[PDB]
Amino acid sequence: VVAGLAVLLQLIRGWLSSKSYVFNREEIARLAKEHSGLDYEVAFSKIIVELRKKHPGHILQDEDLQWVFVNAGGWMGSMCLLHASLTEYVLLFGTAVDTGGHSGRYWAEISDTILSGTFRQWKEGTTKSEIFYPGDTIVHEVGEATSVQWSSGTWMVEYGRGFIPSTCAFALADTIFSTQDFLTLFYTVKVCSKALLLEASTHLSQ
Amino acid sequence: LGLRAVLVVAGLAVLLQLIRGWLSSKSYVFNREEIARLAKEHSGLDYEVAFSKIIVELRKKHPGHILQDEDLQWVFVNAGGWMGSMCLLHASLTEYVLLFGTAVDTGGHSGRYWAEISDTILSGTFRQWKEGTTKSEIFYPGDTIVHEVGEATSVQWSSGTWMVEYGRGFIPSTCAFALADTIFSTQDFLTLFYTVKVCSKALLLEASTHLSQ
Amino acid sequence: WLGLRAVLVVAGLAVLLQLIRGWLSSKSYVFNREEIARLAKEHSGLDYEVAFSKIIVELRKKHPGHILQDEDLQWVFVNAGGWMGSMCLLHASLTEYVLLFGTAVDTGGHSGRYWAEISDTILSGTFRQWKEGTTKSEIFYPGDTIVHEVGEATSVQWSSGTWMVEYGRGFIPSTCAFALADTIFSTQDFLTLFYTVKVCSKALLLEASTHLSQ
Ligand SMILES: Cc1cc(OCCN2CCOCC2)nn1-c1ccc2ccccc2c1
Ligand SMILES: Cc1cc(OCCN2CCOCC2)nn1-c1ccc2ccccc2c1
Ligand SMILES: Cc1cc(OCCN2CCOCC2)nn1-c1ccc2ccccc2c1
């Protein structure tokens, strides 16, 4: 099993290393930084329009968009899932309250471009934290674990790469053992299923 | 489409119709406006004096329904990522009245349950973030917030927030959320014992009052 | 009055507690809360990085063979009771532990109710403590020393730069259940759990090796 799971990780990491992707972290970061310094609602709408223009058939429609609460690692915010597959996902994340906690250690590289508010990150193994402002882009690398903190008006555009199904375990831990808000769990499963079916339908049409 | 699960769906539906029918026709003791007004009368005063005056008024207008001072104690409450303390004045299978608040800065998930809850802030601040929005509102002493049935919001409190809270609905379902952090995070089973203790005392007081009538 | 196994299990657990509590009175610990408190208060009001180094040097001087070496030191995240910080474990046994705790973010939550008396001397930042059964909290500043007694439960809150020297006495294995609750049911950071078990095992083996050499 030692060589078994090692070869399995060789196969999975080889697929992630050779898989023609749709998005890239630089693309979403530039598109978000162009609209940084504006109202986060205007930035959200313009970014959604640009994403559907440059990537048709990959972003959910306005009818299928909804703010879903996200409780994880001790912080609470809300997300609007724009795209999601087995290796990529794009969403609009943020909170209207002061929260913070564990960022989560998962098999996925995540990039967050702050549109408004503040982002305090406390990296592992240090005794000092850094504060990031609108326009900045933060890269949560694979296997990294940090402490995150957000202000009462933080909103950002987030893109994640890697083995996405592994990350959902962390995204639903507090919803199971703390909030017990199973309706929010249903909303998350619903919008994720819609994004997966949209990506599957787009693959079928091609 | 026919299956035994269709009967389970209709069975839960008729079970809900029966339970919601009981909740819709059950002569209650308190009402949210009564508790809200009594708490708003004492807003702008020292919250300890307000607590005492509210307890005296509740025991005057509703004898045999509020616990005595011997059975009152501040119990910590950890739920949804926030932490506060409660003083349970009355509790039944459909209603409960308590004095809630925190002396530290906490916040998190308000909880989605089968109960309508009303909180009248005596002192401090209350930040509420409703579901599906991108902006939150801040409520000040005197305000009254109604957390409706099935609603889920994000709450945040200051380092000196204190309020009088009244809840209506299917109370036993809500206790699962009130003890989640106490089981999987704090593991402070002594606080769990205190919560079960004051809950049992309030239920037995209400049962004894019904027996005397 | 047919207690049967019930009246005996109650008395059995009572005898076990008297056995353990007698052992804690006859264990003749190495450190004491006043010793660690003074050593931390001497360097309060200075940079917490400099204070950490001087306290580690003083601890290794006055108690050789009881503090981990620099090779075995690493900052490990600590998630418990709803708050998140970091620790640097200097010494740990079955009845004592010494570490440098603190956080660089604003956190707070349940202090945890366990079978151990804990003393924290703040080097920098602020410490808000909310005792059970009260409606007001107190704020402690660098130089102060807070004693979380056995069986006590308070609400803790720390600022974005709070750092302290902490010493714990009592039945240490019971406390690890609370220290790893959020890491299991909230963070799911199994690598941090591995780090915690790693540094804890190193401290236990160091103390065992020092006892064997004596
Ligand atoms: C995996 C995951 C982590 C997370 O946390 C908030 C994002 N950021 C994380 C790091 O920095 C702070 C905020 N949400 N989320 C998620 C939740 C639900 C999802 C549903 C479908 C697809 C991806 C889905 C992804
Ligand atoms: C069900 C429940 C929710 C809760 O949360 C704090 C209240 N508020 C909620 C919304 O707004 C913020 C604060 N406590 N609680 C509870 C806990 C223990 C109880 C024991 C006996 C009777 C009712 C008992 C009720
Ligand atoms: C049991 C425990 C609680 C805790 O919390 C931080 C300490 N303080 C608590 C009260 O005041 C605020 C901070 N860490 N910790 C721990 C974690 C890992 C340990 C490993 C080995 C030995 C003791 C070990 C002890």
For C124-193, give the secondary structure using H, E and C.
ECCEEEEECCCCCCEEECCCCEEEECCCCCEEEEECCCEEEEEEEEECHHHHHHHHCHHHHHCCCCHHHH
Q: Considering only CA atoms, which residue is closest to atom 2 of ligand 1?
A: A171
Way the structure was solved: X-ray
Distance CA C91, CA C89 (A): 6
Give the C-alpha distances (Å, rounded to integers) separating A41 from A38, A149, A150, A194.
8, 21, 18, 23
Residue A7 lies in a domain: no
Residue A167 neighbours by CB under 8 Å, 6+ apart:
A104, A106, A107, A108, A160
Give all strands of the β-sheet with A119-122 in edge-to-edge order. Answer: A99-102, A147-150, A119-122, A130-132
Q: Which ligand is nearest to the CA of C118?
A: 3
Give all strands of the β-sheet with C145-148 in edge-to-edge order. Answer: C76-80, C83-92, C96-103, C162-170, C116-124, C145-148
- Which chains have 3 or more CB–CB distances shorter than 8 Å to chain C? A, B
Q: What is the resolution of this structure in A?
A: 3.8
Mutate-to-test residue for ligand 3 from C146, C149, C176, C180, highest number of ligand atoms within 8 A of CB: C176
Could you tell me which chain C residue has the CA closest to the CA of B123?
Answer: C135
Strand pairing report for C127-131 and C138-140: antiparallel
Is the CB of residue C116 below 6 angstroms from any atom belonging to ligand 3?
no
Residue B21 lies in a domain: no
Amino acid making up residue A95: T
Distance CA A71, CA A179 (A): 8
Of the candidates B76, B104, B159, the beta carbon closest to that of C153 is on B76
Residue A174 neighbours by CB under 8 Å, 6+ apart:
A71, A72, A73, A74, B81, C186
Residue A135 contacts C where some CB pair is shorter than 8 Å: no
Give the alpha-carbon dihedral of C107, B131, B80, A193, to 10 degrees. -100
Q: Which atom of ligand 3 is least distant from the CA of C116?
A: 1
Nearest partner of A65 among A79, A46, A86, A51, judged by Cα: A79
Helix, strand, or coil here: B19? helix
Tokens of A158: 């987030």
Roughly what angle, to the nearest 10 degrees, separates helices B47-61 and B32-41?
A: 140
Of the candidates B127, B132, B156, the beta carbon closest to that of A67 is on B132
Of the candidates A74, A125, A173, the beta carbon closest to that of C82 is on A74
Nearest partner of B43 among B149, B163, B187, judged by Cα: B163
Number of domains in chain A: 1
Contact B169/B150 with Cβ under 8 angstroms?
A: no
Residue C155 contacts A where some CB pair is shorter than 8 Å: no
Contact B168/B115 with Cβ under 8 angstroms?
A: yes
Roughly what angle, to the nearest 10 degrees, separates helices A40-54 and A25-34?
A: 140
Residue C99 lies in a domain: yes
Distance CA A101, CA B3 (A): 45
Tokens of A114: 């702050």
Distance CA A42, CA A88 (A): 24
Residue B8 lies in a domain: no
Q: Considering only CA atoms, which residue is closest to atom 21 of ligand 3?
A: C200
Residue A33 lies in a domain: yes
Burial class (CB in 10 A: 0-12, 13-18, 19+), C205: exposed
Nearest partner of C189 among A166, A170, B182, judged by Cα: A170
Contact C191/A145 with Cβ under 8 angstroms?
A: yes
Phi first, then psi, for residue C57 (nearest 5°) are: -65, -45
Cβ–Cβ gap C155/B76 under 8 Å: yes
Tokens of C166: 């902490």
3-state SS of chain C: helix, strand, coil percent to 5?
40, 30, 30
Phi first, then psi, for residue A182 (nearest 5°) are: -70, -25
Nearest partner of C90 among C164, C200, C178, judged by Cα: C200
Cβ–Cβ gap B186/C155 under 8 Å: no
**β-bridge partners, A116:** A155
A133-164 per-residue burial string, b: 16 or more CB within 10 A, e: under 16 = ebebbbebeeeebbbbbbbbbbbbbbbbbbbb
Question: Tell me, what DSSP letter sits at residue A62?
Answer: G
Phi-psi region of C4 (alpha: psi -120 to 50; beta: other; left: phi over 0): left
Tokens of B68: 């005595």
Nearest-Cα distance to chain C for B187, in Å, is: 6
Nearest partner of B112 among B192, B32, B176, B182, judged by Cα: B176
Distance CA C174, CA B188 (A): 12
Position of tokens 């990294």?
Answer: A144
Distance CA B169, CA B47 (A): 27
Q: How many CB atoms lie within 10 A of CB C126?
A: 16
Residue B192 lies in a domain: yes
Helical H segments across chain A, by residue range: 2-18, 25-34, 40-54, 164-171, 173-177, 182-205
Give all strands of the β-sheet with A137-140 in edge-to-edge order. Answer: A68-72, A75-84, A88-95, A154-162, A108-116, A137-140
- Read off the CATH number of the domain in which A80 is found: 2.60.120.10
Strand pairing report for A99-102 and A108-116: unpaired
Residue B176 contacts A where some CB pair is shorter than 8 Å: yes
Residue B140 lies in a domain: yes
Cβ–Cβ gap B188/C112 under 8 Å: yes
Cβ–Cβ gap B127/A152 under 8 Å: yes
Number of cross-chain residue pairs from B and C with Cβ atoms under 8 Å apart: 88
CA angle, C154 then C155 then C159, to 5° = 135
Distance CA B85, CA B202 (A): 17
B74-77 long-range Cβ contacts below 8 angstroms, 24+ apart: B74/C132, B74/C133, B74/C134, B74/C135, B75/B191, B75/B194, B75/B195, B75/B198, B76/B188, B76/B191, B76/C110, B76/C132, B76/C153, B76/C155, B77/B178, B77/B195
Could you tell me which chain C residue has the CA closest to the CA of B99?
Answer: C135
Find the helix or strand (DSSP H, E) in which A83 lies: strand A75-84
Give the C-alpha distances (Å, rounded to integers) separating A73 from C43, C181, C186.
34, 12, 5
**β-bridge partners, C77:** C86
Is the CB of residue B87 below 6 angstroms from any atom belonging to ligand 2?
no
Residue A5 lies in a domain: no
Tokens of C160: 């974005």
Position of tokens 């990506």?
Answer: A199
Tokens of B3: 């299956």
Give the C-alpha distances (Å, rounded to integers) separating A77 from A46, A112, C82.
22, 14, 16
Q: How many CB atoms lie within 10 A of CB A41?
A: 13
Is the CB of residue C84 below 6 angstroms from any atom belonging to ligand 3?
no
Give the alpha-carbon dihedral of C203, C209, C210, C213, to 10 degrees. 180
Range of the domain at A145: 23-205
Burial class (CB in 10 A: 0-12, 13-18, 19+), B78: buried
Widest CA span in chain B: 63
Residue B200 neighbours by CB under 8 Å, 6+ apart:
none
Distance of CA A18 to the CA centre of its chain: 22
Cβ–Cβ gap C81/B186 under 8 Å: yes
Distance CA B141, CA B123 (A): 5
Helix, strand, or coil here: B27? coil
Give the C-alpha distances (Å, rounded to integers) separating C194 from A52, B68, B91, B120.
43, 50, 44, 46
- Which chains have 3 or more CB–CB distances shorter than 8 Å to chain A? B, C
Distance CA A39, CA A44 (A): 9
Nearest partner of C119 among C94, C149, C140, C92, judged by Cα: C149
Could you tell me which chain A residue has the CA closest to the CA of B152?
Answer: A181
Burial class (CB in 10 A: 0-12, 13-18, 19+), A205: exposed
Phi first, then psi, for residue B199 (nearest 5°) are: -65, -40
Contact A180/B111 with Cβ under 8 angstroms?
A: yes
Residue A179 contacts B where some CB pair is shorter than 8 Å: yes
Q: Which of C84, C107, C157, C180 to mutate to test binding with chain A, by most A CBs within 10 Å of its CB?
A: C84
Strand pairing report for A119-122 and A130-132: antiparallel
Taking the centre of ligand 1 as the mean of its atom positions, its distance from the CA of residue B212, in whole angstroms, is 56
Contact A76/B109 with Cβ under 8 angstroms?
A: yes
Contact B180/B158 with Cβ under 8 angstroms?
A: no
Contacts of C133 in chain B (CB under 8 A): 73-74
Give all strands of the β-sheet with B126-129 in edge-to-edge order. Answer: B106-109, B154-157, B126-129, B137-139
Mutate-to-test residue for ligand 3 from C77, C78, C180, highest number of ligand atoms within 8 A of CB: C78
Distance CA B29, CA B206 (A): 11
Polymer length in residues for chain C: 214
Mutate-to-test residue for ligand 2 from B71, B95, B100, B146, highest number of ligand atoms within 8 A of CB: B100
Position of tokens 């909230």?
Answer: C186
Find the helix or strand (DSSP H, E) in which A108 lies: strand A108-116
Residue A11 neighbours by CB under 8 Å, 6+ apart:
none
